[PDB]
């Protein structure tokens, strides 16, 4: 009971409240940063390789 539910995230529900957000590569429900639509683990794994522009490691 996992790949069934991505269709539940995708389809427009009968109430705006039902609708939530999940990662757009691996459908992880928690911790999805809206400026990217990526979960925490997708977001970091692309930043190292460097797909996300602008983002870089912040010493300070």
């Amino acid at each position: 009971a996992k790949k069934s539910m991505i269709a539940k995230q995708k389809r427009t529900p009968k109430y705006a409240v039902q609708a939530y957000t999940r990662c757009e590569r691996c459908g992880r429900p928690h911790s999805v940063i809206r400026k990217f639509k990526l979960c925490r683990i997708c977001f970091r794994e692309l930043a190292y390789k460097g797909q996300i522009p602008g983002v870089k490691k912040a010493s300070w």
């Binding site: 639509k37 797909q51 983002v55 870089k56």
Partner: protein, 204 residues
């Protein structure tokens, strides 16, 4: 203690990002495409030794210059795949897709290509120690100041997993001016997962 990704912390100090495309409130649409327009290119031209696909977009038109070690395979006398992939890339990005290949030099310096020389061989049931050492010495002739190939996993068909590697020369990671490459591929053997890791110090 686990290392850092020797690319993931060189970005923006000695190396740019694999995508140069500014966006204002439209990043989520552009960024998700800059992760899938790099997947159709990943399988369609899988055997053409493609290393970097730097997507740059501007003015409702996208440019994806694919850098390959076999430049004549993607484009050239046939003149068909470039036109053929112009249909597939544009059928996804819903706009112009201008691709201009870049021809690699000193092929044993691109880590992705260098570790695919040891990722197919290991999948063809060869020796772990021989596979790395036969090519570690091979690329060492090119001019790399260092090397480190490791083949980590349930190596050798055993029931207990262990790590193996090699090296030759200088490869200072903790110096930020090092031009160090890196790659990591999946040796999808018939029995499990064994992914290799390769990286190459270079000129300066």
């Amino acid at each position: 203690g686990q290392k850092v990704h020797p690319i993931g912390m060189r970005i923006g100090v000695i190396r740019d990002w694999d995508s140069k495309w500014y966006a204002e409130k439209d990043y989520a649409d552009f960024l998700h495409e800059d992760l899938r327009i790099r997947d159709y290119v990943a399988k369609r031209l899988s055997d053409a030794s493609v290393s970097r696909v730097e997507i740059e977009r501007a003015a409702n038109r996208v440019n994806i210059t694919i850098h390959t070690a076999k430049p004549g395979m993607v484009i050239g006398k046939g003149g068909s795949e470039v036109e053929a992939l112009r249909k597939n890339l544009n059928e996804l990005t819903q706009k112009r897709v201008h691709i201009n290949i870049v021809e690699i030099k000193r092929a044993d310096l691109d880590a992705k290509l260098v570790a695919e020389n040891i990722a197919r061989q290991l999948e063809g049931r060869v020796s772990f120690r021989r596979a790395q050492k036969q090519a570690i010495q091979r690329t060492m002739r090119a001019g790399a100041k260092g090397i480190k190939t490791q083949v980590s996993g349930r190596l050798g068909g055993a029931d207990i997993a262990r790590a193996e590697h090699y090296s030759e020369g200088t490869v200072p990671l903790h110096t930020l001016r090092a031009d160090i490459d890196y790659a990591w591929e999946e040796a999808d053997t018939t029995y499990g997962k064994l992914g290799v890791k390769v990286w190459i110090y270079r000129g300066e």
